[PDB]
Design a protein around this ligand. Structure first.
Ligand SMILES: *[C@@H]1O[C@H](CO)[C@@H](O[C@@H]2O[C@H](CO)[C@@H](O[C@@H]3O[C@H](CO[C@H]4O[C@H](CO)[C@@H](O)[C@H](O)[C@@H]4O)[C@@H](O)[C@H](O[C@H]4O[C@H](CO)[C@@H](O)[C@H](O)[C@@H]4O)[C@@H]3O)[C@H](O)[C@H]2NC(C)=O)[C@H](O)[C@H]1NC(C)=O
Ligand SMILES: *[C@@H]1O[C@H](CO)[C@@H](O[C@@H]2O[C@H](CO)[C@@H](O[C@@H]3O[C@H](CO)[C@@H](O)[C@H](O)[C@@H]3O)[C@H](O)[C@H]2NC(C)=O)[C@H](O)[C@H]1NC(C)=O
Ligand SMILES: *[C@@H]1O[C@H](CO)[C@@H](O[C@@H]2O[C@H](CO)[C@@H](O[C@@H]3O[C@H](CO)[C@@H](O)[C@H](O)[C@@H]3O)[C@H](O)[C@H]2NC(C)=O)[C@H](O)[C@H]1NC(C)=O
Ligand SMILES: [Ca+2]
Ligand SMILES: [Ca+2]
Ligand SMILES: [Ca+2]
Lengths: 71, 141, 71
């Protein structure tokens, strides 16, 4: 999973993470520290076009929408 | 043909039904109280972490208890008398801000009001706001 | 204002003592000093030196605050 088509970004400054999505061939939702450490992959399955991403802050849930699978 | 069946839980700890038991013509089957699930051994029960297993029960935040669960609200929100639905306590009413290509638009949460924040732009494809300085940022692609 | 919840700034009122950038550490608790693109991080004993490092097609500003293209 690599930066091919980055789109959508949300910060979570309480835990110092940045979440972003990519709708490349190997689509995923990534995570990195706000200072550029702890790169990881959060979602990688059943995802094709993650245009949309956010965090609710009150419940601490990640939310996203897929344009292709339409969920 | 067990001769003819009877409850097998009646004898002391046979099959070790952890919570509750019931029988049938030729077999038993244990059961667990609500908030407890049986695991693979088909004899014992464990607590449900409803805050992870079923997040939608609580509107806003959840705390797990052995058995049931309790819903709580983040600071700034109050729980309405239904016991699960948190309501925002600030007397500031939220409104949506979204971008069309040429315009940043202002829309109410219920959709009642609809106005332009700004117009004549190139192609605003993203925006975000800062509450500290009451400032708005956007990318004109 | 609920959608940007109040939190303490790790870089509070001192830029975290960093020369250029103070970024929140992964996990939110700490902070990390960083340098811009055309700068070299010569990490010292108790501080990070952001030594300017800009191409021959770039011009270095007077205070070494940034460097810009030669044109
Ligand atoms: C739209 O909304 C924005 C955001 O709310 C308004 O911007 C603010 O305007 C007020 C003035 O009404 C500013 O208040 C002043 O702040 C000064 C200090 O901060 C400024 O200067 C530093 C300098 O380094 C900057 O870093 C910083 O960003 C600010 O620009 C104070 O020194 C001022 O004090 C003086 O006036 C007050 C009375 O107002 C007296 O009591 C003092 O004695 C003194 O004379 C003043 O408080 C505020 O800083 C602005 N915010 C920002 C982010 O700059 C816009 O004005 C508003 N526009 C309209 C037209 O509605
Ligand atoms: C399935 O089996 C369980 C395990 O025995 C049953 O739980 C028990 O239910 C009884 C009847 O409701 C409870 O008795 C009551 O206890 C209170 C004191 O807390 C007392 O004041 C009442 O007079 C009454 O005796 C008992 O406490 C409870 N056991 C435990 C530990 O929770 C359950 O009822 C069974 N369910 C079915 C549908 O068979
Ligand atoms: C840096 O990134 C890593 C990788 O994404 C983060 O690791 C993950 O952290 C969570 C929270 O602690 C772990 O979940 C927990 O795992 C334990 C079992 O180990 C379980 O008992 C808990 O219920 C919970 O599920 C997760 O497993 C872990 N993943 C890995 C591969 O280690 C880490 O938290 C990040 N650290 C910081 C400070 O940024
Ligand atoms: Ca694909
Ligand atoms: Ca579709
Ligand atoms: Ca529980």
């Amino acid at each position: 999973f690599c930066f091919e088509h980055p789109r959508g970004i949300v910060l979570h400054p309480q835990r110092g993470h940045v979440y972003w999505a990519d709708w490349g061939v190997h689509a995923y939702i990534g995570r990195i520290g706000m200072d550029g450490t702890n790169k990881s992959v959060i979602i990688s399955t059943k995802i094709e076009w993650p245009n949309a991403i956010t965090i609710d802050y009150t419940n601490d849930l990640l939310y996203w929408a897929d344009a292709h699978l339409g969920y | 043909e067990k001769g003819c069946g009877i409850n097998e839980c009646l004898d002391s700890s046979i099959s070790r039904c952890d919570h509750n038991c019931t029988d049938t013509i030729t077999s038993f089957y244990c059961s667990c109280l609500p908030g407890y699930k049986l695991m693979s051994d088909k004899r014992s029960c464990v607590d449900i972490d409803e805050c992870k297993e079923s997040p939608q029960l609580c509107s806003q935040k959840c705390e797990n208890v052995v058995g049931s669960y309790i819903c709580k609200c983040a600071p700034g929100y109050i729980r309405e008398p239904d016991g699960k639905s948190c309501r925002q306590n600030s007397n500031i009413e939220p409104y949506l801000i979204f971008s069309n290509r040429y315009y940043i638009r202002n829309l109410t949460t219920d959709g009642s009001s609809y106005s332009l924040i700004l117009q004549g732009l190139g192609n605003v494809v993203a925006l975000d706001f800062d509450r500290v300085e009451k400032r708005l940022y956007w990318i004109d692609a | 204002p609920y959608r940007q919840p109040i939190m303490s700034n790790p870089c509070g009122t001192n830029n975290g003592g960093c020369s250029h950038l103070c970024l929140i550490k992964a996990g939110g608790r700490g902070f990390t000093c960083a340098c811009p693109d055309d700068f070299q991080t010569v990490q010292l004993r108790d501080r990070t030196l952001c030594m300017p490092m800009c191409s021959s097609t770039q011009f270095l500003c007077g205070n070494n605050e940034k460097c810009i293209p030669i044109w």
